[PDB]
Design a binder for this molecule. Structure first.
Ligand SMILES: *CC[C@H]1/C(=C/c2[nH]c(/C=C3N=C(/C=C4\NC(=O)C(CC)=C4C)C(C)=C\3CCC(=O)O)c(CCC(=O)O)c2C)NC(=O)[C@@H]1C
Ligand SMILES: *[C@@H](C)[C@H]1/C(=C/C2=NC(=C\c3[nH]c(C[C@H]4NC(=O)C(C=C)=C4C)c(C)c3CCC(=O)O)/C(CCC(=O)O)=C2C)NC(=O)[C@@H]1C
Ligand SMILES: *[C@@H](C)[C@H]1/C(=C/C2=NC(=C\c3[nH]c(C[C@H]4NC(=O)C(C=C)=C4C)c(C)c3CCC(=O)O)/C(CCC(=O)O)=C2C)NC(=O)[C@@H]1C
Ligand SMILES: *[C@@H](C)[C@H]1/C(=C/C2=NC(=C\c3[nH]c(C[C@H]4NC(=O)C(C=C)=C4C)c(C)c3CCC(=O)O)/C(CCC(=O)O)=C2C)NC(=O)[C@@H]1C
Ligand SMILES: *[C@H](C)[C@H]1/C(=C/C2=NC(=C\c3[nH]c(C[C@H]4NC(=O)C(C=C)=C4C)c(C)c3CCC(=O)O)/C(CCC(=O)O)=C2C)NC(=O)[C@@H]1C
Ligand SMILES: *[C@H](C)[C@H]1/C(=C/C2=NC(=C\c3[nH]c(C[C@H]4NC(=O)C(C=C)=C4C)c(C)c3CCC(=O)O)/C(CCC(=O)O)=C2C)NC(=O)[C@@H]1C
Ligand SMILES: *[C@H](C)[C@H]1/C(=C/C2=NC(=C\c3[nH]c(C[C@H]4NC(=O)C(C=C)=C4C)c(C)c3CCC(=O)O)/C(CCC(=O)O)=C2C)NC(=O)[C@@H]1C
Ligand SMILES: *[C@H](C)[C@H]1/C(=C/C2=NC(=C\c3[nH]c(C[C@H]4NC(=O)C(C=C)=C4C)c(C)c3CCC(=O)O)/C(CCC(=O)O)=C2C)NC(=O)[C@@H]1C
Ligand SMILES: *[C@H](C)[C@H]1/C(=C/C2=NC(=C\c3[nH]c(C[C@H]4NC(=O)C(C=C)=C4C)c(C)c3CCC(=O)O)/C(CCC(=O)O)=C2C)NC(=O)[C@@H]1C
Ligand SMILES: *[C@H](C)[C@H]1/C(=C/c2[nH]c(/C=C3N=C(/C=C4\NC(=O)C(CC)=C4C)C(C)=C\3CCC(=O)O)c(CCC(=O)O)c2C)NC(=O)[C@@H]1C
Ligand SMILES: *[C@H](C)[C@H]1/C(=C/c2[nH]c(/C=C3N=C(/C=C4\NC(=O)C(CC)=C4C)C(C)=C\3CCC(=O)O)c(CCC(=O)O)c2C)NC(=O)[C@@H]1C
Ligand SMILES: C=CC1=C(C)[C@@H](Cc2[nH]c(/C=C3N=C(/C=C4\NC(=O)[C@H](C)[C@H]4CC)C(C)=C\3CCC(=O)O)c(CCC(=O)O)c2C)NC1=O
Ligand SMILES: C=CC1=C(C)[C@@H](Cc2[nH]c(/C=C3N=C(/C=C4\NC(=O)[C@H](C)[C@H]4CC)C(C)=C\3CCC(=O)O)c(CCC(=O)O)c2C)NC1=O
Lengths: 146, 162, 113, 172, 164, 162, 164, 164
């Protein structure tokens, strides 16, 4: 087979993982800047620290599902209970899809190597099947919440 | 075997006396309760493979490392998945045996005695089976006193695993 | 002479902890304020939750945003309201866990996961 | 031991009397509850491991010195004996609930328990907190429906609460 | 105002009657229940600036569209008139626990409000997003009594009912 | 307490006799072995904070569900992460007691008596503790008979858990 | 406990007699006085964390020398035990308004206190300055009623005269 | 609806009689026989999406001419109304096993059915090819019990006989 393309694409995501999550959850604040006004729910220090923790778990799931090559890692208890966990806590659950849709845009940038401020060295060839394979996983997560 | 009839013969043979209405009233309580206990045994038997397949899938969603981790103790192969569904069928079958005889007798002899020596040896977590028994408790579809008879022996199996 | 709010909380602590989840610690109660400090060291219910162990490597940069869209409020603007002559302060230090609330929480809102 | 039916018989044999007509009508009410008593004993026994463990979990959250080195529950033999005692008290409280009389409860569990914990140094004010935490886990489990027909059981949950208070004052 | 006294004195006057024994028996009920409502009329009148000012933040954290241009939260004078309104309603709820009925909430807070809020394009779903914040956040042994926390939270969702 | 010194005294007291050379040779074997046992106890005590916090991370890397799953049994909170490292330190402290004493007597008394009932009650898995004990066996850096003495009490704890 | 009931029972037990007509006349005083002293015991039991912490730093506002080395307010544990020991004393005053006498203050707070505060070197004029601050903080119409404040202050300076 | 309790009341009212011991003795048969037709009514209440599917194409497998132009099942809008009709008959058989007699199937699904299928050119041989397939796709120890596969099969060919 070709497990080298599989390993190149996972490594390009687990390398830029913390830059991805902090770009995603701050592009989410940038669009509605009332999440960090008083009363908003990324305002306090612990609510900020948990919104950052959520995107790291979500990206870990999509990174580990890409390494195995199946969505059997996606369902977990993560796929079920996220939509009910955010409604019960009281979390803007459509604005939580903006952060996953942003993270989806970055991962297909690093895989297709069209990232507009980072360039990595690969072989030559194609990766636009793996880019679609991770667009589906970022769609399975953002459809489990709505 | 702990049934309500053998535990009444044993309390009269211990002092060497004939059966009285202390013991006849105990066997009478088995007969009045066996109406609801034998409809739950028909229902769990007919719904067996719906409940064994569904409960194995609920352990793999609560503990998804069990399908990922390599090793003989995990359901991450074809052989290890075949032994996991075999284990849910053993637990469901002892529940239907307990509903027939009216006590917690068959799963004492066939399931409980020697259980923790096996889970220690073969590295099986006893919380894998509590989630499986909680699926069967919530999805057998029984109601009334038919459910209370089935749940009372399912909840007995959870108490020995914890 | 029990109450409905008290019996709906304690009935989640009868499931096993492989089933009940965060509801397994629903039997603990609110203690006095001095009980949470240095000889006694009683644990609050928030520390059994995964929100007490949140420490991500990612961070918000706060210079991405436009000027005017970052808000900061204090708790008081008074020096002996923030820290008295004794060390018993609600705001500064290790003595902010010495309070008559916040020993118990709401983990019956969501689920048994 | 003797249950609630045998309790009034023993009080009547010592007077040498037949039972009254009023006394038979008061024992018909004890049979009339009957099934509601067996629902409380079913709910308490079926969740017996989770009542003991989760009320030991909540005791060590509020009194965390018991599991520090030099505490009374610090070692494996001294912790396993603590969970064993909390299961012994819940056993004989369910025995006293099915019988309607607290006679097996004190003649086989409670008499000599205060003398035992005073010779060993076990803190008796912490045992009664563990007893009072199994109480409200069980009187909240008593008055929830969960596959029982709807009705008033508030007279039988005051009797179950009174057996937990009896076990708690015989050790404090 | 609709109180306990004003109902039974109006109705006997509507018939041309004197006060009779059924009137005095209802004002006797204004002696048992009166101790609890005068305990939530006092916890609200001593801590109103702290309940108003972080219930109005729930009105804006849930409806972030209101801070767009053209809405009712665009400049800062409009936002200040919003917090004044939540303080206006809590002063009426405090008036209700002293009178005993829903007299002042009906005449001064409801009777006309559906016209005014529709002309000036203020959504009522943002008004009930903040009154429901106060109700779902009462802590019944800590904030007040048990029966004072029943009758406080009964006048709240009377106002939630009348506006939505 | 089961030491080589107090197993010899208890042998002679159960027979009602003085200490013959059968028991003086058993005590002499402890003195010949106490050189390697008491330098292993010094080297594991000086490496305590390195070995405890390193072996808690070895469990979180092999069983990474133990940091995500809610509930009181897991190292998912501030108090569960504190109680996991406290238990590695209990295991490391009893190994140093056994090296000083010379037998598996401290950890038989303080640790393994009642340990199966505790793990089943509080839902702790014994395969977690085996992984942390395999890290301490592969990271103390001892050599020769000093490593032979330390390893012989680390996999005595492994055989009681497995 | 020293109470009204336990005084008249012990007096008629040492004499070996039944409850007389003068022993029932004392329990009637326990009825007509219970309205005032249960209002003070309920006002205190609801707002006790704010009354204790307001008086705990009235000790250190008068005696700032307690943070010096070797003193009783050096570190965090010693001020946790200090705010505890004040909260112990305010719980016993709540117990004395409920019972009706100086019973719980005598057996649990005062007996043995001189030998402990001298052995452990806790300055007994600072276990007083917190009690004396609460007695003058009380506004007689604002927090409680007139006779509820008479009962509240009379148990507050019993403790002052027992530490002095 | 025609059942046991309707027919013994309509007959005992044609004569003007009180309910007699032959009217009660019929309804005792409603008690012994309901325990077999209710676990064949819930057995179809769960699995009914798979039986309208497995039998709705059994006709179209048999009568493959139905999808030619001009015919009944020529296009998917008409095929969806066709699968809906086998759902309609399976719902009434679930209704019939609850009541005990064929009142639902008669009054709703049978009465007038010949007037319409002749008008709208529906071949009733296709309607009975579905219902006969469900009858013999039935494993009487596996699908349900033995005497439940009597009650399920009894109403299944009563519908066949009323369409044939
Ligand atoms: C969480 C419980 C509290 C606690 C308990 C504790 N108990 C013991 C030891 C014993 N308890 C008994 C009492 C009984 N044994 C019985 O079989 C029965 C049934 C009739 C009763 C009522 C006895 C005999 C012992 C000693 C024997 C033993 O079990 O080891 C211990 C151990 C004390 C020790 O020194 O080993 C504990 C810790 N202690 C606490 O801290 C909790 C508050
Ligand atoms: C960290 C900087 C990574 C990185 C991540 C990438 N982000 C990419 C696109 C992107 N950028 C934003 C910017 C956002 N952050 C803000 O603070 C604000 C304003 C307040 C905004 C708008 C967003 C929302 C997105 C998602 C797509 C979009 O909506 O524009 C991206 C793709 C860019 C490319 O094609 O190269 C990447 C790779 N970029 C890096 O290189 C480091 C490693
Ligand atoms: C208790 C069982 C709850 C709980 C209570 C907390 N509330 C906290 C702060 C806070 N509380 C209120 C409402 C309160 N003030 C009032 O005047 C009235 C009655 C009219 C009530 C009910 C407000 C408005 C605020 C904001 C700040 C303030 O004024 O105190 C609080 C402190 C921390 C926090 O805000 O969470 C607690 C602990 N919280 C709980 O978790 C349980 C469920
Ligand atoms: C703050 C007002 C003081 C101060 C006080 C300290 N008091 C300390 C200990 C202490 N207090 C008591 C009496 C208290 N315990 C009770 O059980 C009851 C009644 C139910 C009462 C009133 C006792 C018996 C003790 C000693 C036992 C203990 O450690 O709690 C204390 C601790 C002494 C120490 O740390 O050695 C302090 C510091 N400290 C101050 O600076 C001002 C004088
Ligand atoms: C951030 C982009 C969001 C946001 C997130 C918040 N989440 C909060 C708590 C929380 N989050 C989760 C889900 C997380 N845990 C998991 O196990 C998994 C997947 C396996 C995920 C995604 C849970 C279960 C919880 C509750 C547990 C806990 O509280 O520790 C949270 C704290 C809310 C609060 O307690 O007040 C926040 C702020 N919030 C946002 O605004 C954006 C949209
Ligand atoms: C897709 C994101 C990239 C891309 C991928 C390709 N990689 C190819 C070969 C290749 N890649 C690696 C690195 C990878 N394999 C590993 O074993 C490990 C880690 C242990 C990693 C990160 C290796 C080692 C190789 C083999 C050649 C070499 O030695 O570098 C490749 C050619 C096909 C093949 O032979 O596998 C492709 C297409 N290339 C791209 O154009 C996009 C951007
Ligand atoms: C009270 C704490 C409960 C509650 C109890 C009720 N149970 C009622 C009837 C009932 N209970 C059982 C089960 C019981 N009988 C047994 O023989 C055995 C096991 C051997 C058990 C566990 C049965 C079989 C029955 C049927 C008898 C009957 O229906 O009379 C009941 C009567 C209903 C009524 O009269 O309203 C009550 C009140 N119900 C509750 O809501 C609380 C939670
Ligand atoms: C904030 C949570 C609201 C919001 C409120 C606005 N209200 C505006 C005007 C306004 N409000 C009232 C009702 C108020 N007056 C009373 O006398 C009483 C009860 C005694 C109440 C509740 C009136 C009568 C008026 C009009 C006169 C005035 O300016 O006060 C207002 C300005 C309207 C405008 O000019 O656009 C705002 C913005 N806005 C929000 O976004 C949420 C829904
Ligand atoms: C009466 C002399 C004055 C007056 C004094 C003020 N007291 C103020 C606040 C306050 N007072 C107390 C003590 C009292 N309230 C209680 O609940 C209890 C015991 C249970 C007592 C002895 C407390 C605890 C507080 C703080 C809580 C509060 O009321 O806000 C006060 C406000 C300023 C301050 O923070 O001290 C004043 C002005 N008030 C009057 O109107 C008359 C003239
Ligand atoms: C499935 C829920 C989970 C799981 C199962 C699993 N089990 C085993 C091995 C054994 N299970 C038993 C249990 C019983 N045997 C009995 O006879 C009875 C009573 C009727 C019971 C309860 C035993 C004895 C074994 C070991 C011997 C054998 O394999 O037959 C395995 C294989 C482990 C191994 O081979 O070492 C597996 C995979 N494991 C999971 O991951 C599921 C979550
Ligand atoms: C850490 C590697 C893993 C983990 C640990 C964890 N353990 C507990 C609780 C207990 N551990 C013990 C064990 C001992 N106590 C002793 O005194 C001795 C001998 C000196 C031993 C070996 C006991 C008795 C408990 C229960 C007491 C208590 O409640 O603290 C917990 C808490 C479980 C709970 O229900 O409270 C945790 C989290 N768990 C993990 O996830 C790690 C993988
Ligand atoms: C409660 C019981 C109940 C029913 C069973 C149905 C019976 C029924 N079916 C149809 C209507 C129809 N029925 C079919 C049926 C079929 N097409 C085929 O190829 C096969 C012959 C057959 C099933 C496989 C078709 C194609 C139509 C639409 C025909 C038309 O509208 O011209 C109509 C006319 C009104 C309508 O279109 O809905 C009615 C009353 N309605 C009911 O209320
Ligand atoms: C109303 C009652 C009722 C039923 C009977 C079943 C009917 C039924 N059985 C099967 C499905 C099946 N049914 C059988 C049973 C048998 N095959 C044989 O050769 C023997 C005659 C018989 C065993 C005695 C088998 C072997 C399958 C699987 C084969 C298949 O799905 O095509 C299916 C397809 C979906 C499924 O598998 O569930 C359905 C709807 N469902 C119901 O709701």
């Amino acid at each position: 087979a070709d497990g080298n393309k599989r390993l190149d694409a996972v490594n390009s995501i687990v390398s830029n993982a913390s830059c991805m999550v902090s770009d995603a959850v701050s592009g989410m604040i940038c669009e509605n800047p009332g999440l960090i006004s008083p009363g908003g729910n990324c305002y306090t220090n612990r609510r900020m620290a948990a919104c950052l923790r959520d995107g790291e778990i979500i990206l870990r799931y999509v990174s580990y599902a890409l390494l195995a090559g199946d969505a059997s890692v996606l369902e977990d208890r993560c796929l079920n209970g996220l939509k009910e966990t955010y409604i019960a806590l009281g979390v803007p659950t459509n604005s939580s899809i903006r952060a996953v849709s942003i993270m989806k845009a970055q991962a297909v940038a690093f895989i297709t190597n069209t990232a507009t401020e980072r360039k990595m060295s690969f072989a030559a060839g194609d990766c636009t099947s793996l880019a679609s394979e991770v667009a589906s996983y970022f769609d399975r997560v953002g459809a489990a919440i709505s | 075997m702990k049934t309500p009839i053998t535990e009444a013969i044993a309390t009269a043979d211990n002092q060497g006396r004939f059966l009285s209405n202390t013991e006849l009233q105990a066997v009478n309580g088995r007969y009045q309760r066996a109406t609801a206990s034998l409809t739950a045994a028909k229902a769990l038997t007919g719904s067996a493979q719906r409940l064994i397949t569904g409960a194995a899938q609920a352990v793999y969603n609560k503990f998804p490392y069990t399908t990922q981790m390599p090793g003989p103790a995990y359901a991450s192969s074809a052989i290890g998945k075949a032994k996991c569904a075999r284990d849910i069928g053993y637990y469901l079958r002892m529940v239907t045996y307990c509903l027939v005889v009216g006590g917690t007798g068959p799963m004492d002899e066939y399931l409980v005695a020697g259980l923790e020596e096996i889970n220690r040896s073969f590295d099986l977590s006893p919380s894998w089976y509590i989630e499986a028994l909680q699926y069967i408790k919530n999805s057998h579809g029984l109601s009334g006193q038919v459910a209370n008879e089935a749940n009372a022996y399912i909840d007995y199996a959870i108490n020995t695993l914890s | 002479v029990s109450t409905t709010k008290a019996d709906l909380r304690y009935v989640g602590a009868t499931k096993p902890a492989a089933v009940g989840g965060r509801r397994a610690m629903n039997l603990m109660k609110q203690q006095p304020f001095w009980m949470y400090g240095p000889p006694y060291n009683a644990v609050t219910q928030d520390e059994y939750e995964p929100i007490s162990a949140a420490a991500p490597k990612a961070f918000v940069d706060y210079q991405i945003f436009a000027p005017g869209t970052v808000k900061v409020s204090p708790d008081s603007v008074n020096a002996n309201e923030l820290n008295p002559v004794s060390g018993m302060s609600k705001y500064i230090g290790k003595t902010q866990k010495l309070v008559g609330d916040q020993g118990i929480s709401d983990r019956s809102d969501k689920l048994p996961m | 031991m003797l249950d609630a039916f045998a309790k009034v018989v023993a009080q009547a044999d010592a007077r040498g009397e037949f039972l009254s007509n009023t006394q038979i009508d008061a024992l018909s009410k004890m049979v009339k509850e009957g099934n509601q008593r067996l629902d409380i004993v079913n709910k308490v026994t079926s969740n017996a491991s989770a009542i003991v463990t989760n009320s030991a979990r909540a005791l060590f959250a509020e009194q965390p010195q018991l599991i520090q080195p030099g505490g009374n529950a610090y070692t494996s033999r001294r912790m396993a004996a603590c969970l064993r005692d909390m299961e012994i008290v819940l056993r004989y409280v369910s025995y006293a609930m099915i019988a309607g009389d607290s006679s097996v409860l004190d003649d086989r569990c409670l008499n000599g328990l205060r003398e035992t914990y005073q010779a060993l140094g076990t803190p008796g004010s912490s045992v009664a907190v563990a007893i009072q935490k199994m109480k409200d886990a069980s009187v909240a489990l008593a008055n929830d429906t969960t596959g029982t027909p709807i009705g008033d059981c508030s007279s039988l949950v005051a009797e179950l609460a009174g057996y937990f208070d009896r076990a708690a004052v015989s050790v404090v | 105002m609709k109180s306990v006294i004003t109902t039974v004195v109006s109705a006997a006057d509507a018939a041309g009657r004197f006060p009779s024994n059924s009137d005095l028996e209802s004002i006797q009920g204004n002696i048992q229940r009166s101790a609890a409502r005068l305990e939530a009329a006092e916890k609200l009148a001593g801590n109103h600036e702290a309940v108003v000012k972080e219930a109005g933040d729930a009105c804006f954290a849930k409806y972030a569209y209101l801070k767009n241009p053209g809405e009712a939260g665009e400049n800062q004078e409009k936002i200040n008139k919003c917090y004044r309104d939540v303080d206006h309603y809590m002063r009426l709820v405090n008036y209700c626990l002293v009178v005993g009925g829903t007299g002042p909430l009906d005449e001064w807070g409801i009777a006309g409000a559906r016209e005014v809020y529709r002309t000036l394009n203020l959504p009522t779903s943002a008004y009930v997003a903040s009154i429901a914040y106060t109700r779902d956040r009462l802590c019944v042994p800590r904030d007040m009594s048990a029966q004072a926390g029943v009758e406080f939270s009964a006048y709240l969702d009377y106002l939630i009912n009348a506006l939505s």
